[PDB]
Design a protein around this ligand. Structure first.
Ligand SMILES: Nc1nc2c(ncn2[C@@H]2O[C@H](COP(=O)(O)OP(=O)(O)OP(=O)(O)O)[C@@H](O)[C@H]2O)c(=O)[nH]1
Ligand SMILES: [Mg+2]
Lengths: 570, 18, 415, 198, 180, 142, 10
């Protein structure tokens, strides 16, 4: 096997050499550790046929870090191949030289890189630009010593728009790892020159050309207006990433534009159709589009204000898209489309996804909290869902009702009777505690509040810490409000939570309640049963500093995760 | 023939718009 | 900023891998399968995975997931675009996307992967252009890649100059269970198969509402496309200036433009369905389909999918026109109609049994989807006005185009 | 009536999970169609296919009445299939094993040593809190017999009843007295296990 | 298609038919089934589960599925409603207190939208004691004439004797079969 | 007594299952998945014993397909291994060179043998030939 | 394959 393969590879017949190379490639791809035969394939490297040269180069690249010592026998071959008349051979040699992760090999590759930097062939120029960036990433000091920065800078100002885009991307990658010292920024003339070649760039070159403008900061409205006018045609590109890059560039440039001029209005009007088109992308790109919309929604919510029908989740939409659809609807939820949002939430509550049902319940609660004009409709929908007799739906409705009562309990007394008998046997800590809190705070419209708390007092000492605290608070509130029917209940609660309760916080709360009851029961009405201030809702809008920084990082991992680039990279 | 509608010849430009 | 593009399989085995930067160890792919299994089993599965400091963003193909490892803050959109381009190139080169070609076309696959992307930055994505430099059965690279026109190879000569267009309509309707349509969007699709001699510069001209308003003819039937996405050959500046659609058509079939505008008209087909499902006894399907489209148009291959019960057995269908069959694989009633003249009315009366024992868990209500496809019908009313085919040599082109109307996201919410 | 081997080969021929689910649904549609017609000739094949689908991860709620009907049948293969279905897809929380008490009582007095043994094994494996209450009288009758092949089954049934109903151990005290002289190793082991459980 | 085989089978008898056996516990259902199948009054324990048997008479296989009257088995009668063509109701005229319960159970079973083609078959069981009513007092109390779209027929059968079983079988055959 | 017995393959597919404890179908499936993950996530020197949910989960697979059991903490550990070996030997003798292919196709025979050998989690016949003879006699009945 | 092998190989 191994001996036969080595003998075939060390033969003078090309028909056997090609078969041996194919077998070695298949074994490596099949998952065979073929790095032991690297020195044997080193001799059979200088071959006229390009079919075996590519396989040998791929094997060397894949077997370069494993056997760096054995890779010292390829510098001469690379130097010889870096001068082949065929541009394809030179490009392949340049790519293989930069792909070899050898510390003692990249030092001698500076001369071929310098020779190929000014190559007339555009493919050779692109290969040299890529190899320069690879060498700089491998060794920044070697690249700086070789003085490739000046050659890379002159590449952008030359012909071959694909080569220019490749050089710009390499320079951006080098500056990305650079400490910002000696930045490759250019004046407005360089921006105009790049825009001139932007219309001639390829699909991949368009992203490279538009990424450069993401770092430049315009200083005048005329320059910003020209940049917006030039980037406007980029919104009509079939590529999803090109449209996203153009949108990000426009958003970045809008930070210096003046809202008084008509350019801002035209940009806002020309961006909504782009968002609608991007929303109809592939399901994999649906999550990215939703993340981008959420990032841009908190900054300029006046662009997609009327975009609500497209936010409806489809039946075949993915889970990662269905979850983001609810967040998008909540962010764009308003009183104008409140009925549509309620109808969509009602339809989304009939599904079987427990996570989807919980997300829909949370979105409905958030929409009800945000807009007080639909509080009655949200309450009716929650009552219908509770009447639907769904355990998870019942818990979600109980949580939503508890959240709504703390925020808008002035006109929440009409639903206490319906919630008084709503299958209180559920053991969910998030729902039982919410029901106990609602009963304690709303112990006025229910004439059997004391009777209901009796069932929850059977296992108060072993139910839960939060549940026990909520039950104790409800009992204290009932005693303060109505101490005739809960006189013995308060004493029993104090005995159970102060003598048989070993919880430190719970024991302290019980002792404090007992002391307050034994000191001044009248003062407990103004101390315990007091009017709490308005509850500060947790705002979902990001901080302005993070939004400005997140604006520049558009389409990357920092935007999908909604986290800073330095808080997620390693 | 062909399913989905028979192919029809297209014009060269808006002759009525000069 | 992908670190290594790899192709996995359904059993977790990596069919092929191609490192681009080498900053991520090749052993991280092993943890991708357990991570994906955990995410799927917990509902947190997403195409963009994360193995600690390395992100595994990839999509699921027909048989394998094209996972591309990345460690830095690389552009997820760029990675997705590269994956889509790679999938398109594989489809163009290999007629099937399965494990049969991954283990058989590695010689050309490795060369294509090496040439497409270098250092994580793709350079070429045109299958037609790439077919002239990398073949599985090599000369210098073509000047088309080096030149600005990288989507139209020069020197193409044909005996005739015939270009076939396809105005494909996508009727997407989202009708709620209450009977109202929520999402009713129609997306145009101008797919042309250009086959001419040389490198003609096509000048597409249609009766656009904006074009008619600019020219002063904003009073006739003008197509109001909310979103118009031109192809790479179409010049964005020319369209932005005066709505001039000037571009060089490619050699073969490609999507030039794709209009996308909302529709405020009544549905072409109105489906009135009822569910007389007895409590574990029987079920009734009083489904009536009313065609609101023009009578001169016929919906070829009408397939109204009616989701029947999953556990239903021994079903009986009492319909009027068209064959109705229940497929246990899909668990729905397939209302298959061969030819549906416009204005036709089909009434169906379903009757199937149900087991006495109730199901353990709920199954949901899948939406009713219609598969109507009526050719030679332009619902949006957009008609092609002209196509300026100009060649330096000078030839008489014979462009052709056909209008096809079908049902897109035309799902009907159940009660 | 598709054979069990053919169904197994078809299931093994499925590669994707979606394809396997589609094949399972296609088979279950035919199985349900056959069951709704009250098929009695190829009922064993349908029962085996349903059991295989349930073991493979498919629902089998609709195939509950068929197992009960086959349990009270007369064919040995049909009775075995019904017993296997009751043992596999039947449990105390199913709530459909209440009607199986009459079938067990009818088969408990059967002259055949295989049908009675299968019924006893099914009762021991799927003993309920109420089935043992109405079956304790019949269990004690078989425990006093001299059948070596049935003594172990009776001991196992008594142990299962005692585990499910600890208050029923009083009816087993006079039945296990003077039973430590069994020559068969299985009978002695069953007696020792019953004594240890008591 | 050809129906020559069906005609040949029907020339000597092909139809079999089905039947159901429901009623209160200790209502003579098991004894009635034993008499119909064997011809003797067999004493059996209360029907914890169910009994399935068949009767061959007039070239029709009258399969009877006896159902117990246990409280836990009352809601289990819906299992036999699937693939069921007939239904026989056995009343308990010797239990005055259980007559109301039997009538309520019959009304509940007769109020199912799936059990519509099953004709009514009222059997007067325990027709041996002087306390048993006639064939009209029981029907009047149960309101059998108020069952719209239901073909009800009351037949009195003595468990100890067996008289009236032939008349009931003939009536069932006439109701099920509509030929010569 | 054995709470449950599950015959699972190396790939994770289950070829046999027999639980003596009345558990919910979803709960049973979750327990089976957890057992498969634990067994599949265990080395070759784990002692073939796992204390999962206070149950002596003993794993001893003599081929590609593994074996599992659920014994309460009241009996010896070697007894379960001896019982598993005896059951494997009896199945091999009844079938004749039993392999993985015969297990999937002949699952009914294996289930019948298990029912005739172990009932309710406890053993029913200590001998290895009497059980085989009884199984053969039952099969010959038709 | 690995499945046709005997469970105990006896
Ligand atoms: N002596 C006598 N007893 C009768 C007569 N008719 C009915 N019975 C009583 O009715 C009971 C009939 O029970 P079975 O024949 O075993 O079946 P069943 O009527 O369905 O009763 P369950 O099994 O409890 O549901 C007997 O136990 C008798 O006590 C009769 O004509 N003479
Ligand atoms: Mg009876």
């Amino acid at each position: 096997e191994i001996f036969e393969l080595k003998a075939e590879l060390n033969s003078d017949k090309k028909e056997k050499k090609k078969e041996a190379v194919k077998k070695v490639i298949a074994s490596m791809t099949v998952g065979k550790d073929v790095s032991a035969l690297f020195p044997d394939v080193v001799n059979c490297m200088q071959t006229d046929n390009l079919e075996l040269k590519k396989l040998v180069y791929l094997y060397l690249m894949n077997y370069a870090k494993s056997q760096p010592d054995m890779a010292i026998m390829a510098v001469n071959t690379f130097v010889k191949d870096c001068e082949d008349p065929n541009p394809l051979i030179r490009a392949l040699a340049v790519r293989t030289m930069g792909c070899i992760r050898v510390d003692k090999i990249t030092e001698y590759l500076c001369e071929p890189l310098r020779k190929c930097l000014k190559d007339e062939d555009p493919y050779v120029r692109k290969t040299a630009a890529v190899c320069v960036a690879k060498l700089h990433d491998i060794n920044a000091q070697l690249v700086e010593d070789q003085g490739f920065l000046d050659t890379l800078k002159d590449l952008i100002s030359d012909s071959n728009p694909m080569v220019v885009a490749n050089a710009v991307a390499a320079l951006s990658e080098i500056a990305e790892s650079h400490p910002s010292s000696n930045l490759l920024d250019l004046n407005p003339q360089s921006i105009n020159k790049l825009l001139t070649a932007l219309n001639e760039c390829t699909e991949w070159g368009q992203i490279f050309i538009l990424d450069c403008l993401a770092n430049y900061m315009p200083k005048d409205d005329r320059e910003a207006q020209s940049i917006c006018e030039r980037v406007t045609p980029r919104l009509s590109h079939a590529n999803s990433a090109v449209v996203l890059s153009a949108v990000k560039v426009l958003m970045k440039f809008m930070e210096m534009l003046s809202k008084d001029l008509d350019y801002y209005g035209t940009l806002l009007k020309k961006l909504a159709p782009p968002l609608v088109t991007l929303l109809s992308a592939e399901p994999e790109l649906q999550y990215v589009a939703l993340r981008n919309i959420n990032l841009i929604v908190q900054k300029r919510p006046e662009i997609l204000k009327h975009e609500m029908k497209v936010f409806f989740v489809k039946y075949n939409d993915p889970i990662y898209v269905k979850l983001e659809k609810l967040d998008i609807m909540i962010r764009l939820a308003s009183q104008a489309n409140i009925a549509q949002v309620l109808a969509e939430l009602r339809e989304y509550a009939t599904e079987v996804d427990v996570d989807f049902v919980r997300k829909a319940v949370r979105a409905i609660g958030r929409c009800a909290i945000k807009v007080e004009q639909s509080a009655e409709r949200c309450v009716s929908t929650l009552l219908d869902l509770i009447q639907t007799k769904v355990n998870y739906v019942v818990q979600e409705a109980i949580v939503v009702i508890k959240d709504i009562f703390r925020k808008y309990p002035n006109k929440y007394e009409s639903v206490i009777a319906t919630l008084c008998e709503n299958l209180d046997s559920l053991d969910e800590p998030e729902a039982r505690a919410a029901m106990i809190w609602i009963v304690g705070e709303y112990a006025e419209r229910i004439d059997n509040a004391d009777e209901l708390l009796e069932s929850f007092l059977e296992g108060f000492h072993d139910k839960s810490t939060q549940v026990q605290l909520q039950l104790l608070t409800a009992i204290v509130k009932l005693f303060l409000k109505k101490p005739t029917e809960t006189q013995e209940l308060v004493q029993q609660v104090l005995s159970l939570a102060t003598q048989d309760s070993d919880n430190p916080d719970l024991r302290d709360r019980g002792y404090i309640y007992w002391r307050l009851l034994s000191t001044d029961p009248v003062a407990a009405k103004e101390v315990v049963l007091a009017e709490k201030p308005l509850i500060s809702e947790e705002t979902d809008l990001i901080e302005p500093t993070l939004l400005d920084e997140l604006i520049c990082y558009i389409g990357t991992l920092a935007s999908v995760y909604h986290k800073p680039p330095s808080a997620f990279v390693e | 023939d062909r399913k989905g509608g028979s192919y029809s010849q297209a014009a060269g430009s808006d002759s009525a718009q000069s | 900023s992908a670190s290594a593009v790899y192709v996995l399989d359904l059993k977790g085995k990596v069919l092929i891998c191609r490192n681009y930067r080498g900053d991520v160890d090749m052993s991280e792919v092993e943890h991708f399968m357990p991570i994906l299994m955990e995410k799927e089993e917990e509902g947190m599965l997403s195409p963009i995975l994360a193995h600690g400091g390395v992100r595994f963003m990839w999509i699921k193909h027909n048989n394998l997931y094209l996972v591309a490892t990345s460690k830095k803050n690389a552009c997820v959109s760029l990675v997705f675009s590269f994956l889509y381009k790679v999938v398109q190139v594989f489809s163009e080169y290999f007629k099937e996307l399965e494990e049969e070609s991954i283990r058989d076309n590695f010689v050309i696959i490795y060369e294509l992967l090496d040439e497409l992307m270098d250092f994580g930055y793709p350079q070429t994505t045109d299958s037609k252009i790439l077919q002239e430099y990398i073949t599985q059965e090599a000369p210098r690279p073509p000047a088309t890649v080096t030149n600005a026109v990288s989507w139209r190879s020069e020197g193409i000569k044909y005996r005739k100059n015939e270009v076939f267009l396809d105005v494909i309509e996508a009727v997407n309707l989202l009708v709620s269970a209450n009977g109202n349509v929520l999402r009713s969007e129609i997306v145009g699709s101008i797919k042309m198969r250009v086959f001419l001699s040389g490198m003609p510069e096509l000048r597409l001209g249609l009766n656009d509402k904006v074009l008619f308003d600019n020219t002063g003819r904003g009073k006739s039937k003008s197509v109001e496309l909310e979103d118009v996405k031109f192809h790479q050959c179409v010049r964005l500046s020319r369209f932005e200036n005066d709505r001039t659609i000037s571009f060089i058509p490619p050699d073969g079939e490609f999507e030039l433009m794709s209009y996308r505008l909302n529709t405020h008209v009544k549905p072409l087909i109105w489906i009135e369905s009822v569910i007389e499902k007895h409590s574990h006894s029987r079920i009734e399907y009083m489904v009536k389909a009313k065609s609101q489209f023009k009578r001169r148009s016929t919906a070829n291959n009408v397939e109204i999918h009616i989701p029947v019960p999953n556990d239903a057995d021994s079903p009986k269908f009492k319909t009027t026109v068209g064959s109705v069959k229940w497929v246990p694989e899909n668990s729905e009633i397939v209302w298959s109609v061969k030819s549906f003249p416009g204005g036709k009315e089909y009434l169906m009366r379903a009757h199937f049994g149900l087991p006495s024992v109730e199901a353990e868990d709920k199954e949901g209500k899948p939406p009713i989807s219609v598969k109507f496809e009526i050719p030679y019908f332009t619902t949006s009313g957009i008609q092609v006005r002209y196509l300026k085919i100009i060649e330096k040599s000078g030839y008489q082109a014979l462009p052709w185009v056909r209008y096809i109307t079908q049902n897109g996201d035309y799902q009907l919410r159940t009660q | 009536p598709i054979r069990l081997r053919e169904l197994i080969r078809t299931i093994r021929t499925a590669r994707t999970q979606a394809e396997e689910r589609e094949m399972i649904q296609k088979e279950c549609a035919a199985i349900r169609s056959s069951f709704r017609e009250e098929d009695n000739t190829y009922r064993c094949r349908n029962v085996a296919k349903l059991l295989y689908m349930h073991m493979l991860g498919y629902p089998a709620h609709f195939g509950q009445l068929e197992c009960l009907k086959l349990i009270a049948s007369q064919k040995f293969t049909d009775k075995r299939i019904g017993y296997l279905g009751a043992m596999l897809l039947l449990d105390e929380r199913q709530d459909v094993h209440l009607l199986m008490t009459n079938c067990i009582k009818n088969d408990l007095n059967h002259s055949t040593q295989f049908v009675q043994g299968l019924a006893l094994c099914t009762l021991g494996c799927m003993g309920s809190s109420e089935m043992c209450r109405d079956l304790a009288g019949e269990v004690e009758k078989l425990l006093k017999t001299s059948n070596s092949y049935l003594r172990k089954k009776a001991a196992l049934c008594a142990v299962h009843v005692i585990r499910k109903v600890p208050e029923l151990m009083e009816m087993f005290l006079p039945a296990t007295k003077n039973l430590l002289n069994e020559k068969n190793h299985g009978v002695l082991h069953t007696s020792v296990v019953l004594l240890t459980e008591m | 298609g050809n129906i020559f085989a069906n005609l040949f089978k029907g020339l000597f008898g092909k139809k079999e038919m089905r039947i159901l056996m429901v009623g209160l516990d200790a209502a003579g259902k098991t004894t009635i089934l034993y008499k119909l199948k064997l011809g003797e009054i067999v004493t059996t324990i209360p029907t914890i589960g169910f009994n399935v048997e068949t009767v061959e008479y007039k070239n029709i296989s009258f399969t009877v599925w006896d159902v117990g009257g246990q409280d836990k088995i009352r809601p289990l009668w819906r299992h036999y409603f699937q693939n069921t063509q007939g239904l026989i109701f056995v009343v308990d005229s010797n239990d005055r207190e259980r007559v109301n319960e039997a009538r309520e159970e019959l009304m509940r079973m007769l109020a199912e939208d799936e059990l519509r083609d099953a004709v009514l078959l009222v059997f007067a069981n325990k027709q041996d004691l002087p306390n048993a009513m006639n064939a009209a007092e029981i029907t009047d109390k149960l309101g059998l004439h108020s069952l719209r779209h239901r073909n009800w027929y009351i037949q009195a059968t003595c468990a100890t004797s067996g008289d009236g079983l032939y008349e009931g079988l003939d009536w069932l055959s006439n109701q099920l079969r509509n030929q010569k | 007594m054995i709470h449950f017995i599950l015959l699972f393959s190396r790939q994770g597919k289950l070829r046999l299952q027999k639980w003596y404890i009345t558990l919910p179908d979803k709960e049973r499936k979750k327990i089976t998945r957890e057992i498969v993950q634990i067994i599949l996530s265990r080395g070759h020197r784990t002692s073939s014993f796992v204390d999962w949910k206070e149950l002596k989960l003993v794993y001893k697979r003599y081929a590609s397909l593994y074996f599992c059991c659920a014994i309460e903490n009241q009996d010896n550990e070697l007894l379960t291994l001896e019982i598993v070996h005896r059951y494997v030997e009896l199945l091999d003798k009844y079938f004749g060179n039993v392999c993985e292919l015969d297990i999937i196709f002949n699952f009914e025979k294996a289930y019948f043998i298990l029912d005739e050998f172990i009932i309710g989690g406890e053993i029913q016949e200590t001998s290895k030939k009497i059980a085989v003879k009884a199984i053969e006699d039952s099969d010959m009945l038709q | 394959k690995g499945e046709n092998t005997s469970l105990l190989h006896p």
